[PDB]
Design a binder for this molecule. Structure first.
Ligand SMILES: CCCCCCO[C@@H]1O[C@H](CO)[C@H](O)[C@H](O)[C@H]1O[C@@H]1O[C@@H](C)[C@@H](O)[C@@H](O)[C@@H]1O
Ligand SMILES: O=c1ccn([C@@H]2O[C@H](COP(=O)(O)OP(=O)(O)O)[C@@H](O)[C@H]2O)c(=O)[nH]1
Ligand SMILES: [Hg+2]
Ligand SMILES: [Hg+2]
Ligand SMILES: [Hg+2]
Ligand SMILES: [Hg+2]
Ligand SMILES: [Mn+2]
Length: 263
């Protein structure tokens, strides 16, 4: 709404693309987020002027509570620093959640397991796996109504090789001649409204499948892929945002490894 203040930064050059080695915009005109495609100062200004609050949700059930300390401490160094952040930790062991020191404007809620809340508390929801650590900047460049992340093992694969659910009997079914990308279930998000629409659709689809005695090959991730095929994401995150260095190394196409699998 409000005007940006005067800012001094390099002029963007029309006849000079930032990245020539990768696709930076999808066929439906959604940016694909890679290092070099965004000026974080301009984006931070835009989002701070709106007093943006980001919710970060993670599940830590059974032995996975062990991953919380590193996850949260690294999120404090790299995730949305400067912005309001609300962590939501869903766990079966509330007393096992580590006591992590948080920066100002950041809070954590422990929710025991064994909603309209989000609508009134945050503007965007980011949903990720907990067996991970942040190694570099993950900020407002990802925020948009609905986003998915390119799975690190398939970003260079032909659609026929994607491990989508291939049985027509499943709600997650995607035939061999369809598909844009293979999105990983470990990192998705968007506005609260869009994330709840997505989770509701996948939940209903999974219930239909269960009633028909079938379980999608990659569970929730198969359904996330069917949803994002039919409801195109407004931004797509590159594999910089979901990487496994032990498994895949550090390819030239990745200028930064931002959020990675814990060995
Ligand atoms: C040594 C195991 C190799 C797995 C590589 C492909 O990753 C898996 O892809 C499937 C879909 O085909 C699922 O998305 C699954 O969750 C992925 O495995 C997980 O992510 C990879 C990157 C790696 O960190 C594995 O250890 C994870 O289990
Ligand atoms: O005992 C378990 C198994 C899974 N998870 C949660 O479900 C996510 C998906 O599981 P996992 O990381 O094992 O899957 P992978 O990335 O290996 O495919 C984990 O990050 C956790 O957030 C959990 O909390 N406890
Ligand atoms: Hg979520
Ligand atoms: Hg998640
Ligand atoms: Hg689901
Ligand atoms: Hg989903
Ligand atoms: Mn995981």
């Amino acid at each position: 709404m409000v005007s940006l203040p005067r800012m001094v930064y390099p002029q963007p050059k029309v006849l000079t693309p930032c990245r020539k080695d990768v696709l930076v915009v999808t066929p439906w005109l959604a940016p694909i987020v890679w290092e070099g495609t965004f000026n974080i100062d301009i984006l931070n200004e835009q989002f701070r002027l709106q007093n943006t609050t980001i919710g970060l949700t993670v599940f830590a059930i059974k032995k996975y509570v062990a991953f919380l300390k590193l996850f949260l401490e690294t999120a404090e160094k790299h995730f949305m620093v400067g912005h309001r952040v609300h962590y939501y930790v869903f766990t079966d062991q509330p007393a096992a959640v580590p006591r992590v020191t948080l920066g100002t404007g950041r809070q954590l809620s422990v929710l025991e397991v064994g909603e309209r809340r989000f609508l009134s508390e945050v503007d965007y929801l980011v949903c990720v796996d907990v067996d991970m650590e942040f190694r570099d900047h993950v900020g407002v460049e990802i925020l948009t109504p609905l986003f998915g992340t390119l799975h690190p093992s398939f970003y260079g694969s032909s659609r026929e090789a994607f491990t989508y659910e291939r049985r027509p009997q499943s709600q997650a079914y995607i035939p061999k001649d369809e598909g844009d990308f293979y999105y990983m279930g470990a990192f998705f998000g968007g506005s609260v409204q869009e994330v709840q629409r997505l989770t509701r659709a996948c939940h209903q689809a999974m219930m239909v499948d269960q009633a028909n005695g079938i379980e999608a090959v990659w569970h929730d991730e198969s359904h996330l892929n069917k949803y994002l095929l039919r409801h195109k994401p407004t931004k797509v995150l590159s594999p910089e945002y979901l990487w496994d260095q032990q498994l895949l190394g550090w390819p030239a196409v990745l200028r930064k490894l931002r959020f990675t699998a814990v060995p």
